[PDB]
RNA sequence: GGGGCAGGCUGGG
RNA sequence: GUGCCCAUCACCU
RNA sequence: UGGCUCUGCCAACGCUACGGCUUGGCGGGCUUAGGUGGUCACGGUUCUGUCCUGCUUCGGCGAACACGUUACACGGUUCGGCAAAACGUCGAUUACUGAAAAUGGAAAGGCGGGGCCGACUU
């Protein structure tokens, strides 16, 4: 939007934006110590935050680092509501000036693209193109390997406002190799970072059938030797340019199924991943033999959304036959 | 920056009040819809609805279980007011649905008050 | 000091909020009367606090300031007619915060 | 004993219609009668969250005050009074609540 | 006993309530406060009788004393007069009667 | 007591005319001021019977609140109701009842 | 032999 | 703790 | 918001310090977002059944019953045509301006499809 973006700290600290950031930061978190300690003097707090950001004295408070194992052993560093609000106020001005240069086929943490628009893009781009083959790649430890230095050569070919840049550099220092997972700022900058490989797939390499979801990159082909080339070129790039090691990759015939984004995406069907089933199966079974068959309806309604995309009719019949509960 | 601190920060009082603000935000509109007549009942309902926040707040800052039970008595009085505004108020005041909705919100605040009473009682 | 200072700083809250609290339409009259009793009645909370030094009295002064902040939130919500505009809440919260600072220092002094 | 409240809520259901009826003329009496009638629920509720006989006696005092209000509103003059029937046919309702309160007081007193 | 005081105080109310409704709108706060002191002292007596702390029998005395204040205050409140010096004399007699009963009751408890 | 109230009657007799001059606009502040002014008599009276110093400090808080009300009516009320002179004369009368309250506080906390 | 599912038993919780 | 979806809950256009 | 410490008028519960006040009618004035859940980006050991043990481009992907791993049928996940524009992106925080790009600042062009235009369906 002008290829210069050279006055964003004026828009980041607009009261009208910090109120959006505030409502975005509090959305869902209105039962937390952070919201409720902030809510007290909310607009006086946003007036001392606006005026911290406007001054260039905003300093990001220390990450409260816990860790959960239920999804996967992570290393989740939280931020204070003040800090998640500053991040929300950045990523209301700064996000749409990055998320607009993200090629259409990056499906992570950008509005109107999702897990579900991505799996659909892959299935779709699998049906059209009649892909005989596909390269699926994945970045080792993506966030904990993002350069935070060649990231700020992309967060700086676009921000050009030398105060947004210094707010971006408070909210995420320009030195190290570790974009924190559990930052709104970081979802964005990882999509941006990876977006570099998108513009080594789509720009260089002239790959027109792909999808990237944050660190996972599907690349439908037709010649499996070309897709192995593409991968080699993608890995060499993302290693030399971005410091990303490719954990897993494969160049499978579209027949193995593209284990993309929680689904297994053939042209014709889209089985979800067995993990999801087993987790859900077990979750349901537990709910039954826990007397919690009323929160199960809420869980079921949820998983009925994660699976309305997938070809889970058979599975939904099967789960209705095993426990009776109204899946769909 | 460090958000403007109140003293005696009680997570439970802050949480209960934010959840009770939803009771107010629901009931205050339908407390203000109560006609001119039934204005004393309304004023008394509004003083029970909007004045329960003070009961929670004083319970939070003056960490004394008495003020928490006074908060419980007020929530029970607010539950009465739902009963009253539904049944005894004649034009209508509160549609049966609205009592069902409000009772859910007050129940949420009831849960939090109960947990808070319990955590203090230990 | 202490009680005298807190009240003079709280007089600024009243000086700001009493005009706002007198503008609340008779419609929101119970809210207004309760807001005015919370605003003008927090002086009594401070006054009692500096006549005892019972730190519980300065905590119930904090509860009153917290109730006053509720009232700001609430009166900014009240959609019928309307009252404390989000700005008026912002300005008032700054004043109450200055009173909050003084109350906090006073609580700590007593501690 | 929470049949008290649900037996008192028929006192309210009887007395509230004729308490709203009390004209603006007798407005202070009405507001105080309505606060006695609708506010006796709080008296019962506080009694039932404690089972302290003090709160049970306060509930009794409120029922006795409500009986006063009936006799007062009887002689309030004009086509604005509580008709002698209503005074009697509410004292019956309050008496039922009075019986339960008495039993409840006794239950607590002889633990 | 609460029954006796209240029946004698009902005479105070029956005299003063008409007078306390005649207190001008100008002196409306004083009137509504006087009415809440007048009707409302019944609750003070009733609470004193349906319990026993003596403190409640003193709060009844304080209310009667506050009612006596209100009489003297309303007598010569302003140019919108409220209670004539006479109405005060009549009311003070009735309040004195309930004062005597309250005193005897305080004594019988003490 | 008796003498404190007789000296506070002078405060009321001075301030009540001032409180009745407050325009309709500031009617709720007036009602609240009048309930602070005319309602401090009850605070003195209840201390007079129930001699507990707790009731005596509430009388002091009420006098201090009445002094706030003078501050408030002189300035914070936008048409500064009480003229600065009237605050001076009122504070003299409140000071006289303050002296008596102080002596009474001292007489009670003799040991 | 390895492997997954559902139950054994023990921790976490 | 972060985002993406799903469900349900209020509430008027 | 059953207001008004508010007036004019008329009455009468009444109260009057005899002025009024009270009270009643009667006019006028003042009066989509959020909440809550729940998907997607705890194990350890032997045992008893139960099935798999296939694939590989050597990265890994599976399997073990969602069992036709699939509602075997498509989601506007449609089909064409374009790609001018706008968008994106590189050109570029470049040329240019100006001492300095300094919170100015292009473009030609190149690359996209994200866009466009129909068809058919939604």
From TrEMBL, chain A:
User: Which InterPro entries would you find in this protein's record?
Assistant: DNA/RNA_pol_sf, GrpII_Intron_Splice-Mob/Def, RT_dom
Give start and end of each Reverse transcriptase domain. Answer: 1-265
UniProt-listed PROSITE patterns? RT_POL (PS50878)
- Molecular function GO labels: RNA-directed DNA polymerase activity
- The entry marks the following residues as binding dCTP, namely 72, 74, 142
Summarize where Mg(2+) binds, as residue positions: 138-139, 215
Q: Per UniProt, which keywords does this protein have?
A: Metal-binding, Nucleotidyltransferase, RNA-directed DNA polymerase, Transferase
Protein name (Swiss-Prot/TrEMBL)? Reverse transcriptase
What species does this protein belong to?
Bordetella phage BPP-1
TrEMBL record, chain B:
Organism superkingdom: Viruses
Residues passing through the membrane, by range? none
Pfam families (UniProt xref): bAvd (PF22296)
Residue stretches making up the bAvd-like domain = 14-120
Q: What is this protein called?
A: Bbp7
Q: Supply the source organism for this entry.
A: Bordetella phage BPP-1
- Name of encoding gene: bbp7
């Amino acid at each position: 939007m002008g290829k210069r973006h050279r006055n964003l700290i004026d828009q980041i600290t607009t009261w009208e934006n910090l109120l959006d950031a505030y409502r975005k930061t509090s959305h869902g978190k209105r039962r937390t110590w952070g919201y409720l300690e902030f809510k007290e003097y909310d607009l006086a707090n946003l007036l001392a935050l606006q005026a911290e950001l406007k001054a260039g004295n905003y300093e990001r408070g220390p990450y409260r680092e816990f860790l959960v194992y239920e999804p996967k052993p992570r290393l989740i560093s939280a931020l204070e509501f003040k800090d998640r609000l500053v991040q929300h106020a950045l990523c209301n001005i700064v996000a749409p000036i990055f998320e607009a240069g993200l090629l259409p086929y990056t499906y992570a943490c950008r509005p109107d693209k999702g897990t579900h628009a991505g799996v659909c893009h892959v299935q779709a781009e699998l049906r059209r193109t009649r892909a005989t083959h596909f390269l699926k790649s994945d970045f080792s430890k993506f966030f904990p390997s993002i350069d935070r230095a060649a990231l700020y050569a992309m967060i700086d070919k676009k921000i050009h406002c030398a105060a947004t840049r210094r707010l971006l550099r408070v909210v995420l220092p320009d030195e190290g190799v570790g974009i924190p997972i559990g930052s709104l700022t970081s979802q964005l900058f990882a999509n941006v970072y990876g977006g570099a490989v998108d513009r080594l797939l789509h720009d260089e390499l002239k790959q027109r059938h792909w999808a990237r979801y944050m660190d996972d990159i599907v690349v439908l082909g037709d010649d499996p030797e070309e897709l192995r080339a593409v991968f080699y070129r993608l890995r060499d790039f993302a290693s030399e340019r971005l410091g990303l090691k490719i954990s897993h990759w494969q160049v499978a015939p579209v027949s193995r199924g593209i284990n993309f984004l929680g689904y297994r995406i053939w042209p014709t069907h889209k089985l979800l991943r067995k993990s999801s089933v087993k987790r859900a199966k077990r979750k349901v079974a537990n709910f039954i033999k826990h007397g919690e068959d009323e929160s199960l309806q809420r869980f079921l309604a949820s998983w009925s959304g994660h699976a309305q995309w997938a070809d889970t009719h058979n599975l939904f019949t099967w789960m209705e036959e095993q426990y009776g509960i109204a899946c769909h | 920056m460090e958000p403007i601190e109140e003293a005696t920060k009680c997570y439970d009082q802050m949480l209960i009040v934010e959840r009770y603000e939803r009771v107010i935000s629901y009931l205050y509109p339908i407390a203000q819809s109560i006609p001119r007549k039934h204005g004393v009942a309304r004023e008394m309902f509004l003083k029970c609805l909007l004045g329960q926040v003070e009961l929670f707040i004083v319970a939070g800052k003056s960490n004394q279980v008495s003020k928490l039970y006074a908060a419980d008595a007020g929530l029970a009085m607010l539950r009465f007011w739902l009963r009253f505004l539904a049944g005894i108020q004649k034009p209508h005041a509160m549609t049966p649905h609205q009592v069902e909705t409000a009772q859910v919100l007050i129940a949420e605040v009831g849960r939090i008050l109960g947990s808070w009473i319990a955590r203090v009682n230990r």
